[PDB]
Curated annotation (Swiss-Prot):
Protein name: General transcription factor IIF subunit 2
Positions annotated to bind DNA: G53, H55
Record's keyword terms, sorted: Acetylation, DNA-binding, Nucleus, Phosphoprotein, Transcription, Transcription regulation
Lineage: Eukaryota, Metazoa, Chordata, Craniata, Vertebrata
Gene Ontology BP terms: positive regulation of transcription by RNA polymerase II; transcription by RNA polymerase II; transcription elongation by RNA polymerase II; transcription initiation at RNA polymerase II promoter
A GO CC term attached to the entry: nucleoplasm
Function per UniProt: TFIIF is a general transcription initiation factor that binds to RNA polymerase II and helps to recruit it to the initiation complex in collaboration with TFIIB.
MF annotations from Gene Ontology: DNA binding; RNA polymerase II general transcription initiation factor activity
Cellular compartments annotated: Nucleus
Family per similarity comment: Belongs to the TFIIF beta subunit family.
Length: 69
């Protein structure tokens, strides 16, 4: 199924996160035209969220239990 995309999609996040510690959903879709709901479900399990002054949506790969790096 699309788990191939999941595993393969995480690789894209590391490349993205390799350039900057933060990325909003809008920046992630440019790097991957895959449905946000699909990316969000991946970011929801290992990602994080942070609203700021103007409510800047930023996601971060939670390294707390990432056995894969």
């Amino acid at each position: 199924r699309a788990r191939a995309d999941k595993q393969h999609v995480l690789d894209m996040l590391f490349s993205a996160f390799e350039k900057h510690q933060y990325y909003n959903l809008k920046d992630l879709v440019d790097i991957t035209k895959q449905p946000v709901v699909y990316l969000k479900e991946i970011l929801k399990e290992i990602g994080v969220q942070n609203v700021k002054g103007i409510h800047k949506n930023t996601w971060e790969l939670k390294p707390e239990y990432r056995h894969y790096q």
